Specification:
The structure is cut from a larger assembly and holds chains A (185 residues), B (44 residues), C (68 residues), D (142 residues) and E (179 residues). By secondary structure, chain B is an all-alpha fold. Chain B has helices at residues 12-16, 32-43. Chain C is mainly α and 68 residues long. Chain C contains three helices and no strands. Chain C starts with 13 loop residues before the first helix and ends in a 19-residue tail after the last helix. The chains are: A alpha+beta (185), B mainly alpha (44), C mainly alpha (68), D alpha+beta (142), E mainly alpha (179). Chain E binds one RNA strand of 245 nucleotides through residues 1-8, 14-18, 21, 34, 117-118, 120-121, 124-125, 127-130, 140-142, 159-161, 166-170, 173. Chain C: Residues 40-52 have a biased composition (Basic residues).
Chain lengths: 185, 44, 68, 142, 179
RNA sequence: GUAUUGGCCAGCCGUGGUGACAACGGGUAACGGAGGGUUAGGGCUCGACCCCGGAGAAGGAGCCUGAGAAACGGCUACUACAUCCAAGGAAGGCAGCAGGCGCGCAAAUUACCCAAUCCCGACACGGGGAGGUAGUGACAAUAAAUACUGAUACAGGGCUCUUUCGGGUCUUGUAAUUGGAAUGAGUACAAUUUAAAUCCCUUAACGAGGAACAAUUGGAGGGCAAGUCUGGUGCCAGCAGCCGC
């Protein structure tokens, strides 16, 4: 029965009460407003629900049986990230449209991905260890055709510092179980 | 072009540019005095 | 500068002065005292209140005993 | 050559100028008042609207870029138009349902540059002013 | 409806012309003006005179309108001193130029009659309450001094240079050193 | 019948009146004029708005008093809004001055006064949100702060003696040195201003040495005046009225 938009406001108010001196200048810590946690589904890292880290009017409620990844990010910069840099991360869309590919090279990679990774995310090095050496043409073609999604690195402004903490929690029928808790954090 | 594009890349260059500060310099005369200095350089 | 310009009035007799001078000038010289009155809005408000009474408006408490 | 030149032919000369004056394009649009009728703005300079979504528009043939326009519905009469957000990285300042204020490109009803089918630009967002936010002269209210 | 206003300058049509840009700057530096506006203002008041003379010149000779207004126009220019007595003719006012008007202003007249070392020193003395014409204290640099009043410019009676008492900082130094 | 003329109206009798020299009808983001803006001459465009004339007081009609009204800070009735109630009843019209809501890109104080210009009444004496004064106010227009000046050195320009690092003479410049006087931006005893105040104008005691008593807005390929210098990005991000990068 907790309201996700109200949770976001509480998270923001605690973090924003802190400040940090770097090279003689004091910087307020700002939430990265366009990042959020999410629910987790079988074999699929992102579901349909979001957990913001600023106050919003999202009234969607958490329900018995759900599992959520609660993650927060703080920054000394603008509190906003953009995509920039070399791409390493990819994932096959489960809802990919049916397409016909003239290039035979793509036809082979598509079979490899479904049979090895399914909808689980993969990286370039996971292809190298399977003996794939001439795949960059086909991978870029699968992205352009809407079959594979790319996830470029996300960066704040140069000279800023960012930190992250995240846990997985199970909303069981009886009690809440914070499954990833350890003695470290 | 099903992809159409991606709006994430807005503001890439301005964000990643290095930041450098103003360095203090002497104040310049203003008003009638500033015109007097200009006249001397261009004709004397 | 060190120059100043004004206006002057010379009267035949002291009694003739008080007859023709405006009152506000007399207060400046101290000959006459100021008039004490209430502000302009309260006087206007009182005037309109008395248009609803007919005859001997000074005392109107005779109607207090109608309720018993 | 071929005009009437007599001393009592003032009627023909006056009538002729009135008829041929319609062939002008600048005068024809002024007399019929097309701006009052067809233009999304009611013959005014600015207008207020509500942002609906963020859209990217491709540049024309020689160029190659994404122009990052936006969709807006006018409060005054409920019409829907598209507007361009100037400067570098300014879409980041605008969210959904933000009450923007618009103006023209100055080409007087025609598209400017390589951007196709766009006639308006965003001047203010949340009543703060776009350019002031860009130079960090003000902070956007929540 | 009951209030009257007017503006005293005009703006040139072409903004960036090399020939015009340096010509005005020479005039500005010579007379120690503040900006280009005072140059344009002098040009406008000179243009009004030319238009009036040009209108009258196309009239017939000995026309009563030409005689009455022509004489009044000529007398005004002689009185202020921007036109010499050897040339009282309606044709000679057309030959007047900009530098003639700038000669007969209080800022330059201070320079010519001693009283100052630089033309920039004259202006700061005018704005401060030092110079007086006749018996009246003047703090307007563009006073446009008349002819017969030229022999009465002198220091103010209350100014430290023309009498009075020592100024603000001189008194403090004398008092501080005294005790 | 009306204050009077009149197809203004009642009877009886004729068949006429306007039009291609634009009648009749439809549009007007239309009150008319004196006039505003822009200029070789000829013109184009705007005019709700301080002066003159006309109309209206939420929409229509009717009427009393009176010299003068088809009046609305006068009355009667219907339509549309809307107020108090003991449930029987009673009352209202800001396109008058302030003020609130809505509409929009778009427009100020619920302040002081009859001292001035004038009006009305039985009246030299009373009244006037007509009208005047102040607050907010970068609508426009006028005047004009942000610094001034010596000496010693160096540099160069002007002239001479003139052989060259040589000497006399003046100006200009200073990450060169020290040396001078002056002024209001503020501020504050007084007087003056004013119906009572404020501002302006005068005036004792204070008020300039740099990290101030610190000027900004747009530009540097061409049209169009001002770099082919140094980092970042790599048809991406973006600039560009136009040719373009």
């Amino acid at each position: 029965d907790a309201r996700v938009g109200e949770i976001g406001g509480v998270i923001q108010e605690v973090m924003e009460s802190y400040e940090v001196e770097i090279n003689g200048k004091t910087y307020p810590v700002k939430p990265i407003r366009n990042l959020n946690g999410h629910n987790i589904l079988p074999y699929s890292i992102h579901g349909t629900k979001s957990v913001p880290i600023v106050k919003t009017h999202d009234q969607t409620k958490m329900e018995e049986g759900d599992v959520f990844a609660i993650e927060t990010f703080g920054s000394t910069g603008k509190g906003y990230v953009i995509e920039s840099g070399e791409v390493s991360h990819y994932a096959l869309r489960g809802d990919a449209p049916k397409v016909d590919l003239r290039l035979s090279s793509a036809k082979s990679l598509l079979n490899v991905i479904k049979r090895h990774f399914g909808t689980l995310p993969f990286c370039r090095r996971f292809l190298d260890r399977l003996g794939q050496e001439k795949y960059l043409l086909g991978l870029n073609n699968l992205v352009s055709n809407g079959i594979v999604e790319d996830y470029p690195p996300l960066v704040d402004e140069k000279g800023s510092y960012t930190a992250q903490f995240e846990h997985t929690i199970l909303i069981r029928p009886t009690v809440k179980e914070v499954i990833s808790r350890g003695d470290d954090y | 072009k099903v992809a159409h594009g991606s709006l994430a890349r807005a503001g890439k260059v301005k964000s990643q540019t290095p930041k450098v500060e103003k360095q203090e310099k002497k104040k310049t005369p203003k008003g009638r005095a500033k015109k007097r200095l200009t006249y001397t350089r261009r004709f004397v | 500068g060190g120059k100043t310009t004004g206006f002057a009035l010379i009267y035949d007799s002291p009694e003739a002065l008080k007859k023709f001078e405006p009152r506000y000038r007399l207060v400046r010289a101290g000959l006459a005292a100021k008039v004490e009155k209430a502000s302009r809005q309260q006087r206007k408000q009182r005037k309109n209140r008395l248009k609803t009474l007919r005859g001997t408006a000074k005392v109107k408490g005779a109607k207090a005993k109608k309720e018993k | 050559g071929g005009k009437p030149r007599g001393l009592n032919a003032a009627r023909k000369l006056r009538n002729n100028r009135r008829e041929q004056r319609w062939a002008d394009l600048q005068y024809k649009k002024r007399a019929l008042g097309t701006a009052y009728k067809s233009s999304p703005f009611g013959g005014s300079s600015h207008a207020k609207g509500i942002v609906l979504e963020k859209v990217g528009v491709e540049a024309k043939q020689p160029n190659s870029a994404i122009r990052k326009c936006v969709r807006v519905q006018l409060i005054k009469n409920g019409k829907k138009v598209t507007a361009f957000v100037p400067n570098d990285g300014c879409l980041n300042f605008v969210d959904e349902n933000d009450e923007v204020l618009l103006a023209g490109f100055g080409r007087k009803g025609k598209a400017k540059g390589d951007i196709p089918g766009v006639r308006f630009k965003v001047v203010k967002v949340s009543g703060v002013g776009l350019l002031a936010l860009w130079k960090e002269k003000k902070e956007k209210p929540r | 409806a009951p209030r009257k206003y007017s503006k005293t300058y005009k703006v040139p049509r072409r903004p960036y012309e090399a020939a015009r840009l340096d010509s005005e700057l020479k005039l500005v530096g010579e007379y120690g003006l503040r900006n280009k506006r005072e140059v344009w203002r002098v040009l406008l008041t000179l243009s009004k005179i030319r238009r009036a003379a040009r209108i009258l010149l196309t009239l017939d000779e000995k026309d009563p309108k030409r005689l009455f207004e022509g004489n009044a126009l000529i007398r005004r220019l002689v009185r202020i001193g921007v036109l010499d007595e050897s040339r009282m003719k309606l044709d000679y006012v057309l030959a007047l130029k900009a530098e003639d008007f700038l000669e007969r202003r209080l800022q330059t007249l201070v320079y010519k009659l001693g009283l100052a070392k630089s033309i920039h020193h004259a202006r700061v003395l005018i704005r401060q309450r030092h110079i007086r014409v006749g018996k009246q204290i003047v703090n307007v640099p563009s006073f446009m001094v008349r002819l017969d009043s030229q022999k009465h410019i002198d220091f103010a009676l209350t100014s430290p240079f023309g009498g009075g008492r020592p100024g603000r900082v001189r008194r403090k130094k004398a008092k501080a050193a005294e005790g």
